[PDB]
Structure formats: C-alpha cells, structure tokens
C-alpha cells in the first residue's frame, strides 16, 4: 500500500475517495472548501455546519 482512503483516511480531514495509482481525492461537506493542503477543510461561509463559534 501507500496512499489509500483506508489508511488514516487518505489524510483527508473529512471525506476521501480513491483515485487511481496511489492517490486520493479529499473533499468536504457543504459550507466548507478544501484547504491549500488539499487535505484540510476550511469554512467557506460565515457559519458552516457542525462548528461552535461562540
């Protein structure tokens, strides 16, 4: 192996999908955008779901 969604979730903060030849495609839920690192998820709206902001 090496890089599959099956190991540490492809390093994806949220969602992972196996691409071909040792690569994965990370993704986030609504209200979020894949960060610069192509692995993390960052707020794309003022109040994204599931987060405490108080």
């Amino acid at each position: 192996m090496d890089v599959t969604c099956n190991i540490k979730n492809g390093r994806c903060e949220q969602f992972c999908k196996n691409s071909a030849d040792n690569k994965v495609v990370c993704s986030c839920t609504e209200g979020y955008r894949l960060a610069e690192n192509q692995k993390s998820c960052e707020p794309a709206v003022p109040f994204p779901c599931g987060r405490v902001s108080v």
Binding site: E13, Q14, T29, E30, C41, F47, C49, G50, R51, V54
Partner: protein
C-alpha cells in the same frame, strides 16, 4: 438527559427545542435555515409545533432565541406507529420563516451514508436536550449534554426482549446512571470529527432511563441521509 452536564451557550448551536401543548416535549436539529430533523413519534400531521433555536434556558430570555412555526411535517414514509411506534423514527419539519444563522443558530453537518456510519463507528457521540434529568422527574431548565459510548448489537439484543431493527443503534452505559430520557427524543446524537460535528443518530426510545443493563436506543441516521438531503434541499 440524566447524569449529564450543563451545556454552555452556543455549545450545541444546531440543537432546537419543540414546544406544543406541553413545552419542551421533544428536541430537534437544524438541517438548514428552513428545516429541522426530529423523531417521528414526536409529531403528528395537523398538530401544531413551535420550534425555538438559539435556546439555552427554557424559562429565561437570552436574546439569542429564534422562534418559528412549523408549516409542514414529514414523517419518514416507512414510519407506521401501528406496526411499531419507533422503527424509522425520524421526521422533518419545515419552518415558516428561515432561521438567521449565527453563533447560536448553526446547522449540524450531515455526511453521506458511508461516512455517517463510519463516524458512528468511531464509538463515541454526544446527546443533548431539555429532557428529564431524573427518570419520572423534572425537565431540565438549562440544556444538558452527555457523551455516550456505542454498544455492540449482540449485547443490546440480549439486553431487551424488544426488537432492535437495523435502523436503530444502542448507546449508553452498562452500569446505568447516565442516558437520554423523556423530553429528549428527536434531539441529536452527534459525532465530532476534527472540530466538526456530524449527525449520527436521533434520540428515540428505551426502557425507562439510565437503568443498569439497559441502553438508550437511537435511530441510525446513515440509513436516512439520502431522504434528508432530498427533502430539505433549498437548492
């Protein structure tokens, strides 16, 4: 919630309370500005419901509350109280005026069925609500929350003579003392992933509350995510 603790204002911004002929009879979760997800046994078509988001203390004014009237009640199509008041225990409520999202009013995230189940299997979720703090006791004034561990199916089936369908999961403590209770149904069971909370279950039923050898039974949300997304789409 029995044996839980006081939430802090804004700690569970997706939590809402449902008020009817009796106040705080059930809870719910914000899907988006116009929709709430709750338990089907909490609602009846044609019966009015008021939703309050941004709620903390149900007997005081915090200036964070947003009250809305429900204009459409959608129990899951497979729900049928006559053939069990708790299988497919999930329903959607459409609000009259959209909620205004802010720090005290924020939706809960809902992943696809694959990940919702993966998150549930992380084994630890949070339940919250204004339900009773003691079996047959008083409803909470301040929102309560409790961390509950997932209980393997084998163990649950053996803990009750009642049927635990594939659309349900069990969570709680073998020793008793902490559990969701009456008044909490419809509220969320969420799993926090890297700071982002996802809806993994709906508080549904049990045999009394917080009793030794008994667990809270929850609606397995992964099985209904497609239906939720389809019905609540504003797009």
């Amino acid at each position: 919630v029995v044996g839980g603790e006081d939430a802090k204002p804004g700690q569970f911004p997706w939590q809402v309370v449902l008020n009817g002929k009796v106040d705080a009879f059930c809870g719910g979760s914000i899907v988006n500005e116009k929709w709430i997800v709750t338990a089907a046994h909490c609602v009846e078509t044609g019966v009015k419901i008021t939703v309050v988001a941004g709620e903390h203390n149900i007997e005081e004014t915090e200036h964070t509350e947003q009250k809305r009237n429900v204009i459409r009640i959608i129990p899951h199509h497979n729900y049928n109280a006559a053939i069990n008041k708790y299988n497919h225990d999930i329903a959607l409520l459409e609000l009259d005026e959209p909620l205004v999202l802010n720090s005290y009013v924020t939706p809960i995230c809902i992943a696809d069925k694959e990940y919702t189940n993966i998150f549930l299997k992380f084994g630890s979720g949070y339940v919250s609500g204004w339900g009773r703090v003691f079996h047959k006791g008083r409803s909470a004034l301040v929102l309560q929350y409790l961390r509950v561990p997932l209980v393997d199916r084998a163990t649950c089936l053996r803990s009750t003579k009642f049927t635990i369908y594939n659309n349900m999961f069990c969570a709680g403590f073998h020793e008793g003392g902490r559990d969701s209770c009456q008044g909490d149904a419809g509220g969320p069971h969420v799993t926090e992933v890297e700071g982002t909370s996802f809806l993994t279950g709906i508080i549904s039923w049990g045999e009394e509350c917080a009793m030794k050898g008994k667990y809270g039974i929850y609606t397995k949300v992964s099985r209904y995510v497609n239906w939720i997304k389809e019905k609540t789409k504003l797009t």
